[PDB]
Amino acid sequence: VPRGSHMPEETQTQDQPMEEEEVETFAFQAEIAQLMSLIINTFYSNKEIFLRELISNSSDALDKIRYESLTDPSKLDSGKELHINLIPNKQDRTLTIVDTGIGMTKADLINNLGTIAASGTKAFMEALQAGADISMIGQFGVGFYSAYLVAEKVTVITKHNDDEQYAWESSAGGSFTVRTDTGEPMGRGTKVILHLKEDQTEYLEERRIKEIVKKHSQFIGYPITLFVEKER
């Protein structure tokens, strides 16, 4: 019976029930798979333009918030700032691009990030064979896959007002997964987590990140902030 003091193990709360996350696996559309293999396995001198492409996608998503308010004003009542955060993590070798844009639903991840061919994909691959600069990518409707210039794996966590939170992930190799994400709620918007290749760790350094934002992304139209972890 009587106790005056308990040890931590004794008062540890019972876990919450384990949750199921549904996972689905999809092949990339053929030309997207071919483009990813070309991007991954070819040397380019201008790999830094991946960040321009990801920032442009965030800016497009943030522009959609403003305009969706013309057909659904309730979004004006959100208190979230429309912004982009860049978050390098040296410990994990990741660079994360976070925005408070519209987010993507599950079917948006499946249809917009791998299973549908952009009409320009074949033309762009021929331009690259003919020696085009990789910087031309986004003009061909396939800018997202520039992430694989620097990343060995990409994870996209996203939440749109009309669906639950999802995670898309791919290490290339011809397929990607989409799985419900019952982890840390991120609130409306998208987080693209780049797991950087070992020779691409310059993109974790604050001066390099500032250099490429100022070179290539000066008309975002929204505040961008770079979080720098304090050196211990």
Q: How far apart are CA 191 and CA 212, in angstroms?
A: 19
Cβ count near 193 (within 10 Å): 21
Provide the minimum distance between the beta carbon of 48 and Mg ion in the complex, in angstroms, as a whole number.
16
- Using an 8 Å Cβ cutoff, are 148 and 171 in contact? no
**Among residues 48, 143, 146, 192, which is the contact residue for Mg ion, using CB under 5 A?**
143
Nearer to ligand ADP, 141 or 201 (CB): 141
Q: Is 73 exposed, middle or buried (0-12, 13-18, 19+ CB in 10 A)?
A: exposed
Does 120 bind ligand ADP (CB under 6 A)? Our answer is no
User: In this structure, what token pair is assigned to residue 69?
Assistant: 């308010």
**Among residues 32, 35, 36, 104, which is the contact residue for ligand ADP, using CB under 6 A?**
104
**Among residues 34, 38, 89, 141, which is the contact residue for ligand ADP, using CB under 6 A?**
141
Q: Which amino acid does the sequence have at 162?
A: D
Provide the minimum distance between the beta carbon of 228 and Mg ion in the complex, in angstroms, as a whole number.
26
Q: How far apart are CA 229 and CA 45, in angstroms?
A: 28
Does 144 bind ligand ADP (CB under 6 A)? Our answer is yes
Nearer to ligand ADP, 113 or 204 (CB): 113
Nearest to 25 by CA among 231, 187, 175: 175
Per-residue binding string, ligand ADP, 58-87, x by CB under 6 A, is x-xx--------------------------
Does 142 bind ligand ADP (CB under 6 A)? Our answer is yes
User: In this structure, what token pair is assigned to residue 131?
Assistant: 């020696």
Nearer to Mg ion, 93 or 140 (CB): 140
Element (H, E) at 226: strand 224-226
Provide the minimum distance between the beta carbon of 58 and Mg ion in the complex, in angstroms, as a whole number.
9
**Among residues 39, 96, 99, 110, which is the contact residue for ligand ADP, using CB under 6 A?**
99
What is the Cα 115 distance to its own chain's centre?
17
The count of chain residues that interact with Mg ion, using the rule CB under 5 A, is 3
Does 111 bind ligand ADP (CB under 6 A)? Our answer is no
Does 101 bind Mg ion (CB under 5 A)? Our answer is no
Q: Classify the C-alpha dihedral 225-143-134-39 as positive or negative.
A: positive
Q: Classify the C-alpha dihedral 205-167-102-149 as positive or negative.
A: positive
Does 48 bind ligand ADP (CB under 6 A)? Our answer is no
Task: Classify 227 in phi/psi space as left (phi over 0), alpha (psi -120 to 50) or beta.
Answer: beta
- Per CB under 6 A, residues contacting ligand ADP are 53, 57-58, 60-61, 99, 101, 104, 112-113, 138, 141-144, 190
